[PDB]
Design a protein around this motif. Structure first.
Motif, short mmCIF file in Angstrom:
data_model
loop_
_atom_site.label_atom_id
_atom_site.label_comp_id
_atom_site.label_asym_id
_atom_site.label_seq_id
_atom_site.Cartn_x
_atom_site.Cartn_y
_atom_site.Cartn_z
N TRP A 38 0.81 -1.18 0.00
CA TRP A 38 0.00 0.00 0.00
C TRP A 38 0.87 1.26 0.00
N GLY A 56 3.12 2.10 -2.78
CA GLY A 56 2.41 2.21 -4.06
C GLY A 56 2.70 1.08 -5.03
N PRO A 102 1.98 -1.23 -7.72
CA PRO A 102 0.97 -0.94 -8.70
C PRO A 102 -0.18 -1.92 -8.77
N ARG A 103 -0.12 -3.03 -8.06
CA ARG A 103 -1.28 -3.91 -7.94
C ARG A 103 -2.18 -3.44 -6.80
N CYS A 104 -1.86 -2.31 -6.16
CA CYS A 104 -2.66 -1.78 -5.04
C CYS A 104 -3.42 -0.49 -5.36
N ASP A 105 -3.70 -0.25 -6.65
CA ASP A 105 -4.33 1.00 -7.08
C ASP A 105 -5.71 1.24 -6.45
N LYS A 106 -6.39 0.19 -6.03
CA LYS A 106 -7.62 0.37 -5.22
C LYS A 106 -7.47 1.28 -4.01
N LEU A 108 -5.07 3.81 -3.91
CA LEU A 108 -4.19 4.93 -4.26
C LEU A 108 -4.85 6.26 -3.96
N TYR A 123 1.95 -4.71 -13.56
CA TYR A 123 0.66 -4.08 -13.57
C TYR A 123 -0.01 -4.49 -14.88
N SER A 133 6.27 -2.95 -14.40
CA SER A 133 5.92 -1.67 -13.79
C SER A 133 6.79 -1.43 -12.56
N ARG A 137 4.43 3.15 -7.46
CA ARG A 137 3.93 4.47 -7.87
C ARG A 137 4.49 5.60 -7.05
#
Ligand SMILES: *[C@@H]1O[C@H](CO)[C@@H](O[C@@H]2O[C@H](CO)[C@@H](O)[C@H](O)[C@H]2NC(C)=O)[C@H](O)[C@H]1NC(C)=O
Ligand SMILES: *[C@@H]1O[C@H](CO)[C@@H](O[C@@H]2O[C@H](CO)[C@@H](O)[C@H](O)[C@H]2NC(C)=O)[C@H](O)[C@H]1NC(C)=O
Ligand SMILES: *[C@@H]1O[C@H](CO)[C@@H](O[C@@H]2O[C@H](CO)[C@@H](O)[C@H](O)[C@H]2NC(C)=O)[C@H](O)[C@H]1NC(C)=O
Ligand SMILES: *[C@@H]1O[C@H](CO)[C@@H](O)[C@H](O)[C@H]1NC(C)=O
Ligand SMILES: *[C@@H]1O[C@H](CO)[C@@H](O)[C@H](O)[C@H]1NC(C)=O
Ligand SMILES: *[C@@H]1O[C@H](CO)[C@@H](O)[C@H](O)[C@H]1NC(C)=O
Ligand SMILES: *[C@H]1O[C@H](CO)[C@@H](O)[C@H](O)[C@H]1NC(C)=O
Ligand SMILES: *[C@H]1O[C@H](CO)[C@@H](O)[C@H](O)[C@H]1NC(C)=O
Lengths: 483, 482, 482
Positions: C60, C63, C65-69, C71, C137, C142, C145
């Motif tokens: 988380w 960042g 990129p598989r955690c964009d939920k 972000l 991602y 990727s 973030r």
């Protein structure tokens, strides 16, 4: 003709609480909790605290040149650091293991300052120009009096320099050094020179070798440079060797020290230091008391009572105070008698039962005092910003014991108060029953505490009751007729 | 004709204290505190301790060559390190995270020693010259058996050297390495070479990278050089890569290990190890007891009673001993003495005696039950730069010791008072049950006894003891006597 | 004609224990221990927890990129991390002071994500090629973030790069960076270049300077490289300067944050988050209770009762239930039963009943009051090299748990005995007040009851209940019956 059984009363307005009842007025009591203190710092075991004035612990011990009033040999029972002290680490940087340094200093008793490495130890360099506007002395640029900022002579390169010192005494030595990190290569070259540069320190039991970590950083106290400050302890017998070809902030003066036999402290407080003595000295003031609990502060030195959160711990010793009930007239003791016959009337305490109650209550109080004669001791060690977990561990623990002791004290007082007042009831009931059993049906109960005699009871008949030798048959006939 | 009510007495000289009075002799009592121990170390759950002899924990686990008596596979319930042990870290320097290593070692059960990186692993360098007079074996210069001191061949430069090992078993592996720090550049050049030099260790989950910190220092154990010793744990499945161009003290042998299912310890003591078993084994000796408290030591393994500072915790079970009481009763705690034409004698009241036994027994067991936990102090060590946590551990350990000692001592004083009061009340109850029955067919005497105004046979008397007296039967006969 | 003294009974089957006896049925009681909870996570002080889903705290906050939920800006009362979360540190390496980061994060309540150093800050380098197959991602390569993996342009050398940011707000800023360590010199040259390389970070109050520690390590998530991740907090007013000639994993986005006024937490749990509110929220569920003790979990946020090991803490308030007692009374605890020519019936004594109610109520409330404090266990984490402080935290937490459990369980046993004894004494008092009045114008019966030797009307009987009887009125009529 009558005899009554009763108990002492008086004008007392003191109340206590019990497990069953609150705000119960009693005739005698004892407060176990001390709430008073003098708001000042006194001597402890006749040794004065050291007032750091406008200097922080670090400003003092490194010798910040605004701190000259503290310079030299000192001794103390505890240290008082003022919260708004302005004179600390004046040239910006970090003191490695700062919090452990303070814990060390709080355990120390006496220090003697001495020149460990005189300027002459460092040849082929400038030892008289290591000053900065960050560390001012009377408007001028200056520097720590315990450290020496060595730079190159402008014409010449920075010589390899060496120094050695051996601890030949029985005391440990606390000393300091640092590595200077200029903001850029221009300044590095100016002060020390380009190329690889090192600061090496070596002992039988510690080794140190480091170089400049050059970087441009925002100015702090007007400086873009930084110093990494270090400290250490050279043990009895050990020897220190120093080598550098630049960037050395050398130890200059250091401290032979002794470790206290007593618990010390660093108190952060604005309270005044005065010409006084205290057996118990807390962070928020001196306590003079023979009580066993205290709600002033958990942090102290000397011999102090146990800290608790309570506002009061009032232990009943005497009786329920119920005048009209009890007899204000008794005065002699706790339990006793009132008689009326042809010779007159009056009150008289029962000595035996009164003393037994005194002996038990006294023993209870002392036993409680005895068993409460230990203290959990909170400490004001510091923790860095990267030590939140241990800081929180220390806090939960200290609050943990505080809550346990506060509970144990408050609950015990409630429970034993109920017992103490019940014991009195039982003692009174006992005397009344001993009289009951004796007189049988030569007197009427009245459901009153008192007995109406069915016969005449002279001043020797009455004293025949007080010693427990009555003789029923003597008045048996006379009594049975009146019916 | 008469009947008395009384209570047991005996020859007991045992005293207890209560909240209200001290030194009170009682007829029966129970000591809750165990004070005795055998001054030795025994087996625990049938596993023996490991005696380190003249070696320190570090001398042992690094393989100081004077510690060959310990070399190889071992297993233990706890470790005994002797305070005067002389064989430790012989080539001077520091073991990083030494205190955490010890905590680890105290939690281990068994180790198996094995060659992790043979000498052949390291090519283009000298692997057979890394000995010192600081670490002697049989009059010769030697070195740790679990580490390898690699140096350059005189004619050749120190090659980049690499080695790898994979843990393919189910046990974790404890291994060691070090970085050598010569006193000056001359020595650095001779042994390794000049320029930047590194020791790099890598795993799936840890990386290490360090260089020589050269400095001229006073000699220690005759050496101006130093080694920084390191340790770590290679987990099942993991692989270790080692890479260096100088200053490497390489792992040579290491230990596969199992973690104990039980609490272990390192005891620092001179006590002898013997052929014995202990349920409870403390730092100052073995305890064999069914008591619930103990004032021997706060440090132990096995199942021990709770540690307290007290010298005694004497809980009254019986009566105040005042021979007053009847030495003659013997049958029970409370009872009767009768006298009539058929004779006289003592007889205990079974019902009230048993109820008191049941209550006191329940009280003892309840106290035992609620005191059946122990706070466990530990002998973890702390460095000179860990004074704050060390002090935190000490205040906490003393903190619980003081609360438990208080709880135990106070409870004993308070319940002793209650227990002796209960006895008083029980005796009074019986006396009153008799009073209520006889009314004015007997005289009180203010004595505990009753003089009957009539003849009371052995059936009249037993009619009192079961509570069925019949007053009208003797009512006339009693009223006549005046 | 008769009058009896008795006490309340009922159909209660509830039992309590005392110090002297177990399984005692009583007429009224109160359970002090709460054992129930809702197995879910609710809002606390109006604020919802943050569910990290398939991400770890680190995934988380860096960042992944598989955690964009997750972000962007978020706010929470506590954090819920799922035990099987897979998306964490994807490119292998270590986060320095990870455990202290989590403690920080648990103490935070809101974050606002913002671009701290845009790509344009770094000139003469490639800012658009720092991706890896380790951090995917949508199947593509990727990267985090919040971090920027800067590499050299192929044709050009890696320029000295600089950046600065000043915190001009009132909130602290949490930010991240790293140092990349390639596995060999070929890769170092390819990405950055040879020679000495540095990553320097500077603030008014912190300085950082490090270089690549190159080493070939076993592959982790397909990579032989590693990144040392760092974090820090830029205080209000402070400014950060960054300088590098290679190996920099630059902060890109960071978080302005606020510190909670309340204790927060990171719970590791699979329990569902729902639309509900809890005053008390434990790791294993929400508690809604007015009880003062609780055996659900020692870990919580909000206002919870004290945790103890007990299964029950049943405090007697009423009487021993022996229907003996009078099921017929119903009006109160203690009282009378009369029989005369006008009839019969039960009637409670108001005065003595109320005094007992007042004392027991006060006892319960006093206990509640004094037990209104909680020791709070915490779920901070400890590394593998922190066994000693981890064990210190555990012994301390278990230490207070054992003290409070003992205090609670013992107190209940002891006061239960006192409470039941108080009732016995209250009944006896009433019976004696009636005995003393009637003398021998009634017969005791050894029964609780009194048979009048005369006629006792409904005014004679109430003359007993207020304590004003007048013996001479009926004295003669008594002496007749003989
Ligand atoms: C220790 O308890 C005492 C009271 O028993 C507190 O002192 C009282 O404080 C209130 C409000 O601050 C005053 O109005 C009273 O006049 C004070 N009483 C006395 C005897 O001084 C005291 O605040 C407590 N100490 C602490 C730190 O809370
Ligand atoms: C262990 O404790 C038990 C009770 O906790 C003790 O048991 C009593 O022991 C004596 C004989 O030594 C018997 O006369 C009693 O009848 C036992 N009491 C009960 C209730 O069973 C025992 O003595 C203790 N053991 C030792 C070695 O002291
Ligand atoms: C707290 O204690 C309660 C009640 O004593 C436990 O809940 C009981 O669990 C037992 C054994 O599994 C069962 O007999 C009952 O169904 C439960 N009773 C009630 C009233 O819930 C509970 O397990 C304890 N909590 C924990 C975490 O151990
Ligand atoms: C006291 O008396 C009895 C027998 O009369 C005896 O068996 C007992 O052991 C004696 N006391 C002690 C301490 O042994
Ligand atoms: C109680 O007895 C002990 C010795 O057994 C003695 O030391 C102490 O002085 C006594 N105390 C009192 C108050 O009698
Ligand atoms: C309790 O143990 C101590 C050890 O601290 C011992 O010396 C003492 O004798 C013990 N108490 C008794 C009554 O023996
Ligand atoms: C109070 O004075 C008495 C003198 O009888 C002393 O023994 C007691 O220890 C004193 N209180 C404290 C807290 O030291
Ligand atoms: C009381 O005692 C027995 C065991 O002796 C136990 O099985 C029973 O369930 C207990 N009852 C209660 C209510 O705890």
């Amino acid at each position: 003709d009558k005899i009554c059984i009763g108990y002492h009363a008086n004008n007392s307005t003191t109340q206590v609480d019990t497990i069953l009842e609150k705000n119960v007025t009693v005739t005698h009591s004892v407060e176990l909790l001390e709430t008073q203190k003098e708001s000042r710092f006194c001597r402890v075991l006749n040794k004065a605290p050291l007032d750091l004035g406008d200097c922080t612990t670090e400003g003092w011990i490194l010798g910040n040149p605004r701190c000259d009033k503290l310079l030299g040999d000192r001794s103390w029972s505890y240290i008082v650091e003022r919260p708004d002290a302005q004179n600390g680490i004046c040239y910006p940087g970090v003191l490695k293991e700062a919090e452990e340094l303070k814990a060390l200093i709080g355990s120390i008793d006496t220090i003697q300052r001495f020149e460990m490495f005189p300027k002459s130890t460092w040849t082929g360099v400038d030892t008289n120009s290591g000053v900065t506007s960050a560390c001012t002395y009377n408007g001028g640029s200056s520097f720590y009096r315990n450290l020496l900022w060595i730079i190159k002579i402008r014409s010449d390169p920075y010589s390899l320099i060496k120094g050695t010192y051996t601890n030949t005494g029985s005391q440990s030595i606390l000393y300091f050094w640092g590595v200077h990190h200029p903001p850029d290569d221009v300044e590095q070259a100016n002060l020390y020179g380009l190329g690889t540069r090192y600061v090496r320190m070596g002992t039988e039991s510690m080794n140190f070798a480091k170089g400049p970590e050059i970087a441009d950083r925002p100015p702090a106290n007007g400086q873009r440079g930084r110093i990494d400050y270090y400290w250490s302890v050279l043990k009895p017998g050990e020897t220190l060797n120093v080598e550098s070809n630049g960037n050395l902030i050398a130890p200059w003066y250091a401290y032979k020290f002794t470790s206290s036999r007593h618990k010390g402290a660093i108190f952060r407080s604005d309270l005044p230091i005065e010409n006084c003595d205290a057996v118990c000295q807390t962070l928020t003031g001196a306590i003079n008391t023979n009580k066993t609990f205290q709600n002033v502060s958990p942090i102290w030195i000397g011999e102090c009572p146990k800290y608790v959160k309570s506002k009061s711990l009032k232990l009943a010793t005497g009786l329920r105070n119920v005048p009209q009930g009890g007899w204000t007239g008794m005065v002699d003791g706790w339990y006793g008698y009132h008689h009326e016959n042809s010779q007159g009337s009056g009150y008289a305490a029962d000595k035996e039962s009164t003393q037994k109650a005194i002996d038990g209550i006294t023993n209870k109080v002392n036993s409680i005092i005895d068993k409460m004669n230990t203290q959990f001791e909170a400490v004001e060690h510091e923790f860095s910003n990267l030590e939140k977990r241990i800081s929180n561990l220390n806090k939960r623990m200290e609050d943990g014991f505080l809550d346990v002791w506060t509970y144990n004290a408050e609950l015990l007082v409630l429970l034993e108060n109920e017992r103490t007042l019940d014991m009195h009831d039982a003692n009174v009931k006992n005397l009344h029953e001993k009289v009951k059993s004796q007189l049988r049906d030569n007197a009427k109960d009245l459901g009153n505490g008192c007995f109406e005699f069915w016969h005449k009871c002279d001043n020797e008949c009455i004293n025949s009751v007080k010693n427990g030798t009555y003789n029923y048959p003597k008045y048996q006939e006379e009594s049975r007729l009146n019916r």
